[PDB]
Amino acid sequence: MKGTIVGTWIKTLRDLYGNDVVDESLKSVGWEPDRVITPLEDIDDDEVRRIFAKVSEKTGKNVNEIWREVGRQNIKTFSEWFPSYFAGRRLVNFLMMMDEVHLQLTKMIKGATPARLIAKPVAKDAIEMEYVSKRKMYDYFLGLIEGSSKFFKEEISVEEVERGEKDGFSRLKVRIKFKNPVFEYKKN
Ligand code: HEM
Numbered sequence: 001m002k003g004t005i006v007g008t009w010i011k012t013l014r015d016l017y018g019n020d021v022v023d024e025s026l027k028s029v030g031w032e033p034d035r036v037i038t039p040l041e042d043i044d045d046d047e048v049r050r051i052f053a054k055v056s057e058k059t060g061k062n063v064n065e066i067w068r069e070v071g072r073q074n075i076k077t078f079s080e081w082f083p084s085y086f087a088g089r090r091l092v093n094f095l096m097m098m099d100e101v102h103l104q105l106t107k108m109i110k111g112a113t114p115a116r117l118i119a120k121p122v123a124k125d126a127i128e129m130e131y132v133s134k135r136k137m138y139d140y141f142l143g144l145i146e147g148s149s150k151f152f153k154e155e156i157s158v159e160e161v162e163r164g165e166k167d168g169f170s171r172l173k174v175r176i177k178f179k180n181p182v183f184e185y186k187k188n
Contacts, residue, residue, distance in 0.1 A: 001048055002109065003041035008081075009048075010037075012073050016066075017059050025054040042109055045135070064139045071143020075151050091152040092182045095119055095129060095145075124181040128161065129174050136170035138163060145174065155179055 013022045023033035029047045037043065056063040079086050085101065086094065099117040106114040115133035122128045131141045142158070149156045157177040164171050 001043050001045055002039065002106065003037040003043055004039045006041075006043040006048060007037045008074060008077050009070055012070050012077065013051075013055055013066075015073065016069060017055060017061075021055060021058050024058065025051050028054050042111075067137065067139040068143040071140040071145075072147040072150070074144060075147030079151055086151070089152075090182075091148060091154040091156070092127065092178060094148060094152065095127065095176065098129075119176075121183045122175065123177075124183050125179075126175055126177040129176060131170075131172045131174075133170050134168060136165065138170070138172050141172060142174070145176065 010022060010026070013025075026033050026035065029050050031047075052063050052066060055061075056066060059066075085097075089097075096119050099119065102114060102117055106112075113134050115131065115135065115137075117129060117131055119127045119129040129145075131138070142160075145156075145158055149158075156179075159175045159177070161173040161175055162171075163173070
């Protein structure tokens with residue numbers, strides 16, 4: 001996982017559960033508790049997993065629950081940090097651009113198996129978004145959607161259409177319904 005994002009997760013874990021819980025969890029995997037992670041590092045996914053697992057043990061919170069909340073809160077961090085991804089945009093705009101943004105952000109990562117977040121219109125007031133990846137971070141994904149609705153102050157309805165795994169790839173499809181029309185038919 002790209003360093004920058006892991007950095008944001010750690011800060012969020014601190015916001016959620018406190019510095020001792022997080023400091024201890026980082027040590028248990030051999031990190032300096034105040035380790036400074038850079039945009040160049042590809043942090044080992046297993047070590048992240050063990051960090052979250054340790055936080056789960058210390059807080060008594062379920063790890064899926066933790067990921068959900070980290071997803072929710074992550075959006076506020078992104079909005080204050082990178083205001084450019086949010087500026088002059090509505091929620092639908094923001095969501096439709098995520099796939100492209102993530103391809104840009106992982107272009108340099110050695111081992112090029114980056115998650116896809118392809119969204120497409122399926123009605124005048126609704127899109128389907130499909131998370132496809134090697135990593136199966138379902139709860140994080142859903143939390144991120146909730147965080148986005150929260151930030152843009154646009155109420156949505158989120159229905160999971162299906163989830164599944166095949167050929168090592170996880171897939172989660174959601175239908176997101178907006179309060180009023182955001183699309184119209186157009187000559188193809
Ligand atoms: C400006 C806002 C955002 C930024 C800057 C951002 C950036 C990133 C970065 C750098 C990663 C690391 C991926 C890797 O290292 O392979 C990541 C992961 C991920 N992002 Fe975002 N993200 C944003 C918002 C969102 C939103 C709104 C969603 C969903 C609606 C989303 C879905 C995901 C998921 C599911 C992953 C896990 C990747 C995987 O499973 O391989 N992100 N994001």
